[PDB]
Amino acid sequence: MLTRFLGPRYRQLARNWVPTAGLWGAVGAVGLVWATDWRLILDWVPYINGKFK
Amino acid sequence: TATYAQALQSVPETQVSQLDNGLRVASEQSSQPTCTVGVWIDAGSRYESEKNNGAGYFVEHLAFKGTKNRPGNALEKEVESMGAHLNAYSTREHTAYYIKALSKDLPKAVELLADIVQNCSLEDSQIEKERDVILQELQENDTSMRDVVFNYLHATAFQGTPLAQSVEGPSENVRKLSRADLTEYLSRHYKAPRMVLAAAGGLEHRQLLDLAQKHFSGLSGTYDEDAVPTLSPCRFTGSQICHREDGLPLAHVAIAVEGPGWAHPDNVALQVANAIIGHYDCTYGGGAHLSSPLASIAATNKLCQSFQTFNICYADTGLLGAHFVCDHMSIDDMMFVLQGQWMRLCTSATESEVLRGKNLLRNALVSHLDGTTPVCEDIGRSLLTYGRRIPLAEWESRIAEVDARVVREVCSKYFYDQCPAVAGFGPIEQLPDYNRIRSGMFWLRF
Amino acid sequence: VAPTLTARLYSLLFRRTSTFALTIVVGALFFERAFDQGADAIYEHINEGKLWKHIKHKYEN
Amino acid sequence: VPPHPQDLEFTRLPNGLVIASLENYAPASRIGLFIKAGSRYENSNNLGTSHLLRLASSLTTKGASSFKITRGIEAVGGKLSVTSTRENMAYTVECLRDDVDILMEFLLNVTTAPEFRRWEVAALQPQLRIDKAVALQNPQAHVIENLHAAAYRNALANSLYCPDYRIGKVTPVELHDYVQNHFTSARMALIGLGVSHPVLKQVAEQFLNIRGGLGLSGAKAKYHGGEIREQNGDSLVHAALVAESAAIGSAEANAFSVLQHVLGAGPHVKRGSNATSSLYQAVAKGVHQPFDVSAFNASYSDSGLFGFYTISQAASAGDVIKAAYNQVKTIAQGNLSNPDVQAAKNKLKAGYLMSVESSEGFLDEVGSQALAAGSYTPPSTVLQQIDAVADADVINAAKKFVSGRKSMAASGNLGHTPFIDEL
Numbered sequence: 003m004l005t006r007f008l009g010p011r012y013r014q015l016a017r018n019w020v021p022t023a024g025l026w027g028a029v030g031a032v033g034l035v036w037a038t039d040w041r042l043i044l045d046w047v048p049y050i051n052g053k054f055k
Numbered sequence: 056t057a058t059y060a061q062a063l064q065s066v067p068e069t070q071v072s073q074l075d076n077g078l079r080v081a082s083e084q085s086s087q088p089t090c091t092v093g094v095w096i097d098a099g100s101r102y103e104s105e106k107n108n109g110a111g112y113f114v115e116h117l118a119f120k121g122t123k124n125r126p127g128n129a130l131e132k133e134v135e136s137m138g139a140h141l142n143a144y145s146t147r148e149h150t151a152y153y154i155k156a157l158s159k160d161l162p163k164a165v166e167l168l169a170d171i172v173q174n175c176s177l178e179d180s181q182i183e184k185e186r187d188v189i190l191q192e193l194q195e196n197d198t199s200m201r202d203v204v205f206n207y208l209h210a211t212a213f214q215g216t217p218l219a220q221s222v223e224g225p226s227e228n229v230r231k232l233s234r235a236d237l238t239e240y241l242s243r244h245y246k247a248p249r250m251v252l253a254a255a256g257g258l259e260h261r262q263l264l265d266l267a268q269k270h271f272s273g274l275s276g277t278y279d280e281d282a283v284p285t286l287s288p289c290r291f292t293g294s295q296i297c298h299r300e301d302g303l304p305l306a307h308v309a310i311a312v313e314g315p316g317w318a319h320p321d322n323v324a325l326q327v328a329n330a331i332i333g334h335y336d337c338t339y340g341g342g343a344h345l346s347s348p349l350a351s352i353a354a355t356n357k358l359c360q361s362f363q364t365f366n367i368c369y370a371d372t373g374l375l376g377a378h379f380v381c382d383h384m385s386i387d388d389m390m391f392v393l394q395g396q397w398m399r400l401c402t403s404a405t406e407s408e409v410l411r412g413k414n415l416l417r418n419a420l421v422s423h424l425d426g427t428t429p430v431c432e433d434i435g436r437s438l439l440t441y442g443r444r445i446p447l448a449e450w451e452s453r454i455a456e457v458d459a460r461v462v463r464e465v466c467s468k469y470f471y472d473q474c475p476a477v478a479g480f481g482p483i484e485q486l487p488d489y490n491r492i493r494s495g496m497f498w499l500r501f
Numbered sequence: 502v503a504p505t506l507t508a509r510l511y512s513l514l515f516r517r518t519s520t521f522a523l524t525i526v527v528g529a530l531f532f533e534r535a536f537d538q539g540a541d542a543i544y545e546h547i548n549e550g551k552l553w554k555h556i557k558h559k560y561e562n
Numbered sequence: 563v564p565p566h567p568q569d570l571e572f573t574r575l576p577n578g579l580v581i582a583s584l585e586n587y588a589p590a591s592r593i594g595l596f597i598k599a600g601s602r603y604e605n606s607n608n609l610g611t612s613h614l615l616r617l618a619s620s621l622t623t624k625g626a627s628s629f630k631i632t633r634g635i636e637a638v639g640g641k642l643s644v645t646s647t648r649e650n651m652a653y654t655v656e657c658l659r660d661d662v663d664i665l666m667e668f669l670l671n672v673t674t675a676p677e678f679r680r681w682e683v684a685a686l687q688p689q690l691r692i693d694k695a696v697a698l699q700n701p702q703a704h705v706i707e708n709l710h711a712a713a714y715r716n717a718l719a720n721s722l723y724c725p726d727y728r729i730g731k732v733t734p735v736e737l738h739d740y741v742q743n744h745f746t747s748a749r750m751a752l753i754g755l756g757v758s759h760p761v762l763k764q765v766a767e768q769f770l771n772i773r774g775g776l777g778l779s780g781a782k783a784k785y786h787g788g789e790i791r792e793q794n795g796d797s798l799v800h801a802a803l804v805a806e807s808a809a810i811g812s813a814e815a816n817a818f819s820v821l822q823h824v825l826g827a828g829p830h831v832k833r834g835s836n837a838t839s840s841l842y843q844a845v846a847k848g849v850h851q852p853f854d855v856s857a858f859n860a861s862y863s864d865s866g867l868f869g870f871y872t873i874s875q876a877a878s879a880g881d882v883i884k885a886a887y888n889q890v891k892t893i894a895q896g897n898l899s900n901p902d903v904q905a906a907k908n909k910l911k912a913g914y915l916m917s918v919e920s921s922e923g924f925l926d927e928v929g930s931q932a933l934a935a936g937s938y939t940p941p942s943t944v945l946q947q948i949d950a951v952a953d954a955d956v957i958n959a960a961k962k963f964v965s966g967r968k969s970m971a972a973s974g975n976l977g978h979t980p981f982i983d984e985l
């Protein structure tokens with residue numbers, strides 16, 4: 003059922019859509035990081051230092 | 056053998072020589088027994104004032120009805136008797152008068168064009184007869200939904216600019232235009248550096264230049280010493296015109312973004328992208344199996360009676376987009392499917408469909424350039440827009456350069472997140488609101 | 502501000518919905534910091550010393 | 563210096579098939595298979611079969627599926643066209659030089675291996691109603707259908723469009739039958755532009771050796787006459803008046819073709835009084851409202867129809883017809899100058915030459931010449947043919963029309979339109 007999706011057009015179709023799919027992941031990451039307050043990721047951010055000891 | 060490549064080199068170079076007048080005189084030779092000869096003029100509606108809007112169109116009605124050397128009938132009688140055909144046309148940017156005749160009849164053909172173009176007997180009795188003729192043609196054109204929507208699209212896209220005007224002008228300007236109004240435009244525009252004598256067929260460029268000096272030389276003496284007119288840029292407006300008429304059985308919709316103009320190298324990639332989307336009409340036999348996704352979805356779901364893409368070019372500007380005709384209940388779906396294809400091409404154009412687009416375009420270009428009339432037209436227009444004849448091998452060169460990346464870069468440049476000019480006519484209740492149309496000019500996923 | 506800052510903000514970030522989103526989420530994180538304590542500092546001035554945060558050092562071990 | 567132009571290659575094969583090619587060094591290529599299979603070979607039991615057939619050109623073949631024919635031709639940006647006339651069907655195929663092979667193959671499959679699948683034919687039947695509706699929106703189409711139905715009792719009476727009662731009634735077997743007995747070697751011509759003679763001769767020898775159907779180009783048009791009248795309401799009146807003339811190829815037909823230019827075909831000048839058009843000038847004399855008039859000239863394998871066609875206001879119809887008719891009468895009575903004919907010669911000669919100057923018009927002419935004549939006759943001698951027509955022949959052509967049993971079709975408000983009877 004998956005052999006129909008493999009060929010040169012789909013190679014081009016994947017490459018055409020990858021800068022976008024990568025940038026949506028960056029959106030999701032920053033988005034998840036910002037929303038839960040992941041001080042694990044956010045401690046290393048040069049202005050966001052709300053954990054100001 | 057003969058490869059497609061080799062064939063392009065075999066087509067002889069369009070030979071250009073210039074008169075002291077500034078009349079560019081050009082020809083493409085062949086072994087043909089016939090020919091087409093014409094004068095292409097750098098005049099149209101874009102040069103007109105608002106107060107003389109039907110002026111060029113009016114001269115076009117008067118040009119074949121008498122001269123100082125051939126009063127009334129005489130011209131017709133001469134052209135008719137040698138078996139020749141004599142035609143004319145006027146766009147917003149270009150006016151042309153051409154003769155299809157036997158190659159041996161080229162001496163009289165050029166002679167008659169000279170008389171038509173220089174010695175127009177604008178007899179006041181004939182201008183009055185033409186007044187009724189043009190007014191009657193205005194009522195005639197009203198019934199052509201396609202002619203209207205494009206005038207409407209021009210009117211709204213080029214809001215307030217000379218390009219917004221139609222070629223024929225408004226009724227009042229036909230009713231009130233005088234011989235003076237007509238002579239003035241004639242003298243200001245039918246000047247030698249804005250005229251190209253074009254020919255194609257069984258010719259000799261030597262013989263044509265001889266004739267051009269024989270009959271057109273007579274525009275020397277003094278030229279351009281008081282006033283010179285150069286075209287001002289025309290503002291494009293992303294706008295909508297909706298003429299709601301629930302008594303016409305099918306809706307006409309023409310939607311377009313601003314194009315770049317004649318000169319721009321990226322008209323090629325646009326044309327390729329247009330070729331991919333193409334054109335459909337209910338008498339096409341292909342239906343479901345058509346390559347263009349819009350054409351196939353149109354055919355399957357009968358979404359449409361006809362659609363066609365266009366890339367209308369003017370100096371430094373244009374109209375890029377599609378026009379369709381359909382039933383009242385199918386306008387929405389037609390827009391969606393059209394705009395979805397523009398976006399598909401903007402973001403995710405694939406390599407093979409771009410080959411098909413290139414292939415359709417090489418075929419179109421070579422099919423069009425068949426016979427003396429289309430080629431003579433191409434010489435005249437090309438010289439007026441590109442300043443030269445762009446040879447076929449150069450077109451092939453510039454076509455072959457377009458790949459998938461080119462299409463999506465170029466389609467995005469012109470289509471992506473750009474304001475359409477939209478013109479609608481007929482049963483248009485279901486025609487999407489401008490905001491909605493404008494929202495189809497981008498994708499939230501991209 | 503040569504081809505306008507808004508024009509370069511559009512061509513660099515706003516064009517694609519991806520970079521538009523990324524600008525909002527990156528912007529929402531920056532703004533949250535500059536506003537939370539930035540508005541708390543204004544809340545400090547209207548209550549100059551009447552808050553426990555100001556009293557603090559009066560009762561320290 | 564252009565290239566010195568090549569010469570047309572011609573060959574009749576023993577089996578009756580004809581091959582003609584011209585290497586014109588064009589960037590594109592055109593191949594046409596012309597077949598004696600037009601509407602005339604339909605009978606009273608299978609009307610419209612050659613219409614649906616014309617519509618069937620991209621249905622499934624042995625060797626190429628429907629989807630392949632479409633996507634295959636579209637991939638290379640070529641065309642597959644089919645043009646029927648009352649005598650011929652013509653399958654034409656266009657593409658760039660490098661792509662002749664794939665399109666040829668498609669051509670051969672459409673014409674020699676069509677499968678006509680039950681459900682595919684079923685799905686295509688409604689295209690007959692659209693196809694017919696789109697043509698019939700020119701008042702001229704019904705007028706010329708009707709003109710033929712009235713002229714002939716026979717084969718040329720059949721219309722190029724399918725009668726309504728037949729739509730959805732044409733069977734997959736009827737088309738198989740039509741192909742097997744009309745698309746045969748001796749009824750065929752394979753014309754090629756931008757192709758080589760060996761290659762055409764090869765595919766002809768390999769793929770086009772079919773014979774097992776009918777023989778006669780003349781199953782035989784029995785000219786009869788009479789009129790058909792269609793009340794319409796319709797803005798203005800269309801009327802064609804016609805008599806039997808001359809079979810295409812004969813010397814007589816050339817006289818008719820000259821007569822047509824003495825009286826008047828289409829215009830030559832954009833928006834003109836048509837000064838040399840003797841029919842137009844004759845009606846104009848006493849009709850001071852919108853009208854049109856042209857000489858009509860139809861030439862076939864074994865018959866012909868010459869006369870005139872008129873467009874006029876409902877109330878002016880009879881005046882326009884009677885004026886046109888009397889104008890022909892004066893030429894039959896002897897009133898025709900030498901320069902009058904000389905101009906008609908020049909109008910015809912020039913027009914013919916212009917008619918073949920493109921590759922589309924060239925291929926069609928070489929095709930129709932191959933079927934009607936079995937020859938290629940160069941322009942140089944066609945012009946010689948025309949020249950041999952004397953003034954006395956053109957007079958004799960007008961004499962034949964005036965004195966010959968008429969045929970008439972007309973449509974509109976027929977209230978003031980005459981009846982042959984009254985002409």
Ligand SMILES: CCCCCCCCCCCCCCCCC[C@@H](O)O[C@H](CO[C@H](O)CCCCCCCCCCCCCCC)COP(=O)(O)OCC[N+](C)(C)C
Binds near residue numbers: 029472515518
């Ligand atoms: C129901 C009860 C609640 C009551 C709420 C009432 C108060 C009003 C607030 C409601 C929300 C309305 C939002 C305001 C409307 C603005 C439109 C917005 O949605 O943008 C759209 C598109 O949406 C955004 O682009 C998406 C950006 C995503 C930003 C992130 C949002 C924060 C959520 C965090 C995500 C992480 C998930 C959480 C993980 C835990 C369309 O943009 P548009 O104006 O047409 O511009 C076109 C785009 N161009 C420029 C590319 C052409």
